C-alpha cells in the first residue's frame, strides 16, 4: 500500500497496522517449539 | 576518559563498558545453552569459571574507574550501555542461583557467580557515590531496576529464603529436634521443623529440601547447610539493601 501520495490519495493503514505480540530469543523460541 | 592535550581522544571507559556488554552477552548465550540440560558438564563449568573471572576483573576495573567521586566517569557510565549489561547479568544471576542451588556438585560455580554478583553491586553502589537528590544516575538506575523487576524480585526472594534459615536454626523447635550437639538431622525432622515454624510455605519448603543433598542414612548437616547458603546471602543482601 502506497503512502507517498497521501496528499491526493489517502492510504489505508487499517490493513497495514501490525501488533508485536511476542519477542523471544532464537534459543527460547526453539525450546518452546520443541516443548 | 579524555586526553586534554592530544589531537585525538579515545574513551577507554566506553571501550571497557562495550567489552563488558559483549562478555555478558556471551555468558547469557552460554547459560541459554545450558538451561535445558539437567547437569552442567565439567568443560562447561571451566568455561563458566573463566568467563566469570573475566567479568569480575572487568567489574573491578569499572569500579576503580568511578571510585573517588570521578563525576566525568560516572556520567560517562550513566550515558553508556552499562545498564543493558546489568540487566542481562541480573537475569543470569536470578536464574542460575535457583538452577545451581538444587545441585550439590555446582558449589564452586555458585560461589564464583555469587561473588560476581557482589562485585556487580559494589560497582552499582560506587555509581551512586556523591549522589544528589533527583539525580540523573538515580533515575537511570531506577529505570534499570524497573526493566529488570522480575529478576530483582527473584533474587530478593532467594535471599529472604536463605536469611531466615539462620533464625530457624537458632529456634527452639530445631534445637529440640536436635537435642544433642552432633548437629546432624534427617529430612523428616528438618521438614517437620520447617512446617512447625510456619514461616516457610510448601514451595519454599520443597525448594529448601531439594537444595539439601540426601546422604546414605538420610541425615543432612544443617550447620554447613546454613553457613554455605547464609554467608554469601548475608553479604550480597546487605549491599542490595
UniProtKB/Swiss-Prot annotation, chain B:
Q: What induces it?
A: By TGFB1.
- In which tissues or organs does this protein occur? Detected in heart muscle (at protein level). Heart muscle, brain (cerebellum and hippocampus) and placenta.
Compartment(s) of residence:
Sarcoplasmic reticulum membrane
Q: What is the effect of changing residue 137 to V?
A: Decreased function in release of sequestered calcium ion into cytosol by sarcoplasmic reticulum. Changed ryanodine-sensitive calcium-release channel activity
The entry's comment on post-translational modification says: Channel activity is modulated by phosphorylation. Phosphorylation is increased in failing heart, leading to calcium leaks and increased cytoplasmic Ca(2+) levels.
Its domain comment says: The calcium release channel activity resides in the C-terminal region while the remaining part of the protein resides in the cytoplasm.
Sequence similarity: Belongs to the ryanodine receptor (TC 1.A.3.1) family. RYR2 subfamily.
Disease named in the record: Ventricular tachycardia, catecholaminergic polymorphic, 1, with or without atrial dysfunction and/or dilated cardiomyopathy: An arrhythmogenic disorder characterized by stress-induced, bidirectional ventricular tachycardia that may degenerate into cardiac arrest and cause sudden death. Patients present with recurrent syncope, seizures, or sudden death after physical activity or emotional stress. CPVT1 inheritance is autosomal dominant.
Function statement: Cytosolic calcium-activated calcium channel that mediates the release of Ca(2+) from the sarcoplasmic reticulum into the cytosol and thereby plays a key role in triggering cardiac muscle contraction. Aberrant channel activation can lead to cardiac arrhythmia. In cardiac myocytes, calcium release is triggered by increased Ca(2+) cytosolic levels due to activation of the L-type calcium channel CACNA1C. The calcium channel activity is modulated by formation of heterotetramers with RYR3. Required for cellular calcium ion homeostasis. Required for embryonic heart development.
Oligomeric and partner information: Homotetramer. Can also form heterotetramers with RYR1 and RYR3. Interacts with FKBP1A and FKBP1B; these interactions may stabilize the channel in its closed state and prevent Ca(2+) leaks. Interacts with CALM and S100A1; these interactions regulate channel activity. Identified in a complex composed of RYR2, FKBP1B, PKA catalytic subunit, PRKAR2A, AKAP6, and the protein phosphatases PP2A and PP1. Interacts directly with FKBP1B, PKA, PP1 and PP2A. Interacts with SELENON. In cardiac muscles, identified in a complex, composed of FSD2, CMYA5 and RYR2.
Protein name in the entry: Ryanodine receptor 2
Specify the species.
Homo sapiens
Lineage start: Eukaryota, Metazoa, Chordata, Craniata, Vertebrata
Report the gene name: RYR2
